[PDB]
Design a protein around this nucleic acid. Structure first.
Lengths: 56, 147, 51, 170
RNA sequence: GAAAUUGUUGAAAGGGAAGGGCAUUUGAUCAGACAGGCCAGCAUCAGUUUUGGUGGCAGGAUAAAUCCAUAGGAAUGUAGCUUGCCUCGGUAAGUAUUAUAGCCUGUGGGAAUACUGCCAGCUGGGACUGAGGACUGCGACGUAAGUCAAGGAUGCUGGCAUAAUGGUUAUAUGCCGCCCGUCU
RNA sequence: AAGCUCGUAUCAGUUUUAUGAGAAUAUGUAAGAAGUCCGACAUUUGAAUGAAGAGCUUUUAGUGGGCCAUUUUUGGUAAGCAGAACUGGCGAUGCGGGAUGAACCGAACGUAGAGUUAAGGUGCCGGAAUACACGCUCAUCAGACACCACAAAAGGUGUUAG
RNA sequence: GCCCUGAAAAUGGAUGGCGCUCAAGCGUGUUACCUAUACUCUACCGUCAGGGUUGAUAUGAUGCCCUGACGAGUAGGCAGG
C-alpha cells in the first residue's frame, strides 16, 4: 500500500501539472464513496414477480 | 431564492414520480446525503470503541444532538453505534425550529447564542455565508463548507 | 443578556430573516399547487394489486 | 401495532454487464415503511444470496384495500419458528380487510403459541369467495342465513363508584 | 463556681423504642421598620413550559371508499312458477338471475373525508420566573416627529403597619434513615 | 509542578481507501514540503471526523493483596472450581427501580424553582386507569418476571389452535 | 400453548403483604398517565479559561468588568482561610 501512496502522489502531481498546463480546476483531493443520486428504472426488461416466501 | 429552490426541488421530484408512474417507470429517489443524530444512553457503562466515536461526533452527553454528512465512513460509524443513538433524514422545518431555538455557535471558544446575522458575517463572512438562512441552506444542501 | 426564541417575538423573528414579512401576505403554506392530469399505467396498477 | 399493507420492490444492484437484475417484489405487512423495508431485506436474503449493500429498493406503494365494506372470509397459510423447531399452518378468518384480519391473527398466534412478530412468516393471505371450501367450524357457524344470536349479561361499566339501584342486566 | 449527674416548679409529649433529615400545623417566644416596611390581587408584555378549539395547504392509486351509470355472474336465492301435505300459509325441494328484495365482481365518471406531513395562520386558559440597573446596537410601525411586544418588569389598587408574614424552639403528622472510629 | 520549544500543534482505545502477517472480529504500517526534479512545484499542499492543546529536559507524592461478568481455550457433574489471554463493573461512587442486597436495569452529583423523561410500573398499601382490544387458563399448595430455588424424559378420558 | 403430575420436611410463614380468576394472571397491541440529584430553561455561589481595563477625579491590581463551559471523588498533591 506504500506502492499505492507513491503512485498516488505522483499521479496527483501529474494531474496538477496538467491542470496548470491547460487551465481547469485541479480536483486533487480524494473523496469517499458518495451517496447515489436519482436514476430512473422501468420494468420493460422484466415485469416484476412475487417472491412469496413459501419454502416450508 | 432559497425558498424558491426548496419548493422547486420538491415539485420536480413529485413530477418525477408522477411521470414515472405514467410511463410505467419507478422513480427511485436520490439517497439522503444528510442525517441528524441524538444520543440516548448516557455517559456510563459505555465501551471505549463507541466512546471515542461519540467524542468524535461531539455527542458528549445525553440528548445533545448534531448533524452528519453521509458517506460510507460515517455510515460505518452509525452502523457501529446503532445501539446507542437515534437518527433519521430531517426536514427544513425541523432544522428551522432547531437553529432558531437551540441554535448556539462557537466563536473561537465559548458557545454563544446566534441572535443576529452580524455574528454570522463576522465569523463566516470568510465563506460568503453571512446569514442564518444561508447557513441552513449550507446544511440542508450539503455545501462545500459543511464541516 | 437573554435569548428570545423566534417562532415567537416576531420582532426578533424579523431581526433575522426579514422574508417573513412578505411571507405573510401570500401566506406561503397554502401554495395551491396547480393540478395536472398525469395518470398512471395499467402495469403500475396491476403490479400493485395483483400478486 | 395498527398494521398496514405495503408493496415493496427491490433491485439487487445497478452493475456493469448485469444491468437491471430482473426485479424482486413482496407484499408486506407493517405499521410504517421502515419495518416493511427491514422485513423485506430479511425475507429477501433468505431467498437468495444478496445483501442490503448488494440490494436496493426500486420503490414502494402503500395499498389501500378496494372494498372496506365487504366482509371477506379469508384463509391464510403461515410458517413460524416456535420455541421448538418450525412448522406450518392453514387458518380461516372472517374479517373485513387483510390488514384487520392479520392484525387479529398476529394477536391470536401471540396468545395460542406465544408467537412474537419476528418468527412468523406470512406465507400467503387470500380470499375465499365461495362457500364449500371452508374447512373449519369457528368461521362456518356465522354463515347460515337468518342468523341471529343474543348478547346476554352485558357487563355495564359505571364511572361512579357508588350506585343506589342494585343493578340489572337488560 | 462550667459539664456529666441530681432535685423542685413551669410548659409539652408518651400503646414494644429514642435521637436525626425535608415541609408545615398548633403552642410558647422574638429582632427589625413604618416616620417610605409586610402581605396580597387585577391588566399588559418578555423567557421556559403545558393544554384546547378553530383555519389554510401538499401528498399517496392525484387516496382507496361511498355515490352515479354500465356488462356479467352467483347465492347463506328476492319476487314469480311448480310440486308433497296442510291450522289453508308454512315448511322441504326444484325452478327463477331483479322480477313484488338485493348482493358480488369488472369497467367508467366527479367529488369529499380519513391518514401522514407543512404554515415565518389565527386565538384562548393555567403555572414557575422578574434576573439586570443614565444612554449606546441589530429591529418593526410609519411621510414623519416620534411610538413599540426592539440587548432581562412595569403600572394601578387594596389591607396591616402587628408577632399578621417570617426566624428560633418542644410536639404531632406524611415520607426517609441500618452505629460511630479502625485493620480486613 | 518548574523551565525550553511549537501552536494549529502534533495527534486519536475511531472509521474509510490501500496493503500486509494471520475468514469476520481483531491486528500492523502509508494517506505528503521532513515530498517531486537539475534553481522549478504553497493551503484543493494531497481522505473523513474532533480537538480547555501538543512535544523535549529535571524532579516530586501515593501505588505495585484481587473479585465478578462476556469472548477464545482445557477438564469434568460442577460449584462460593481450577489452566491460560482481550474487554468491561467494582473497589474511592452517591442517586431512581429491582419489596430489601458485594455483582442486575437506568443514570454519575454545587445550591434551588418549573418542565420532561429514562429503567420499573398504574386493584389497595403507593404517586399513576379497576383504560380499550384480541385469545387462553379454573390448579385439594394455580401463576405473577429475565439471569434475584430454573429440572427434564415423559404420563394425563382437562381445554385450545394445528 | 395454558393446565395437573413429575418437582417433600420437621418452632408459625409468605407472588413483598392484602387478596386476585371474561383477573389485579399468562401472551400481544394502542394511546394516556406516574417520577430520579440524569436531559432542557432560569437566578445565585465557586473555580477555570478567553477578552477589555493606571487614566484623569478616588479609596483596593492578588482588584473591577464582559462572555462561556464545568462542578462527584479515598490515598496523595495545590491554594486560600
Amino acid at each position: 500500500c506504500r506502492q499505492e501512496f507513491l503512485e498516488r502522489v505522483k499521479a496527483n502531481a501529474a494531474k496538477r501539472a496538467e491542470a496548470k498546463a491547460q487551465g481547469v480546476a485541479v480536483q486533487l483531493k480524494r473523496q469517499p464513496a458518495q451517496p447515489r443520486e436519482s436514476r430512473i428504472v422501468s420494468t420493460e426488461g422484466n415485469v416484476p414477480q412475487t417472491l412469496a416466501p413459501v419454502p416450508y | 431564492a432559497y425558498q424558491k429552490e426548496y419548493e422547486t426541488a420538491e415539485r420536480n421530484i413529485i413530477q418525477a414520480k408522477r411521470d414515472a408512474k405514467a410511463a410505467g417507470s419507478y422513480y427511485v429517489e436520490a439517497q439522503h446525503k444528510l442525517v441528524f443524530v441524538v444520543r440516548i444512553k448516557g455517559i456510563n457503562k459505555i465501551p471505549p470503541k463507541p466512546r471515542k466515536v461519540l467524542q468524535l461526533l461531539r455527542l458528549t452527553r445525553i440528548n445533545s444532538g448534531t448533524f452528519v454528512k453521509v458517506t460510507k465512513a460515517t455510515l460505518e460509524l452509525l452502523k457501529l453505534i446503532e445501539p446507542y443513538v437515534a437518527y433519521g433524514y430531517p426536514s427544513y422545518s425541523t432544522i428551522r425550529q432547531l437553529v432558531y431555538k437551540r441554535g448556539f455557535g462557537k466563536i473561537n471558544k465559548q458557545r454563544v447564542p446566534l441572535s443576529d446575522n452580524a455574528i454570522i458575517e463576522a465569523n463566516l463572512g470568510k465563506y460568503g455565508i453571512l446569514s442564518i438562512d444561508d447557513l441552513i441552506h449550507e446544511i440542508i444542501t450539503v455545501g462545500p463548507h459543511f464541516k | 443578556v437573554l435569548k428570545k426564541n423566534p417562532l415567537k417575538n416576531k420582532q426578533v423573528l424579523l431581526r433575522l430573516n426579514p422574508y417573513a414579512k412578505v411571507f405573510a401576505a401570500e401566506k406561503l403554506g397554502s401554495k395551491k399547487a396547480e393540478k395536472t392530469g398525469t395518470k398512471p399505467a395499467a402495469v403500475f396498477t396491476e403490479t400493485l394489486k395483483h400478486d | 401495532a395498527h398494521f398496514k399493507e405495503y408493496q415493496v420492490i427491490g433491485r439487487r444492484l445497478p452493475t456493469e454487464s448485469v444491468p437491471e437484475p430482473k426485479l424482486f417484489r413482496m407484499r408486506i405487512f407493517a405499521s410504517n415503511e421502515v419495518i416493511a423495508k427491514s422485513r423485506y431485506w430479511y425475507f429477501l436474503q433468505k431467498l437468495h444470496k444478496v445483501k442490503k449493500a448488494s440490494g436496493e429498493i426500486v420503490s414502494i406503494n402503500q395499498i389501500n384495500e378496494a372494498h372496506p365494506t365487504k366482509v371477506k372470509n379469508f384463509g391464510v397459510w403461515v410458517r413460524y419458528d416456535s420455541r421448538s423447531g418450525t412448522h406450518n399452518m392453514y387458518k380461516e378468518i372472517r374479517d373485513v380487510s387483510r390488514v384487520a384480519a392479520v392484525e387479529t391473527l398476529y394477536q391470536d398466534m401471540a396468545a395460542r403459541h406465544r408467537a412474537r412478530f419476528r418468527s412468523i412468516h406470512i406465507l400467503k393471505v387470500a380470499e375465499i369467495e365461495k362457500t364449500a371450501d371452508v374447512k373449519r367450524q369457528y368461521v362456518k357457524q356465522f354463515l347460515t342465513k337468518d342468523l341471529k344470536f343474543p348478547l346476554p349479561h352485558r357487563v355495564q361499566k359505571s364511572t361512579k363508584t357508588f350506585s343506589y339501584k342494585r343493578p340489572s342486566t337488560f
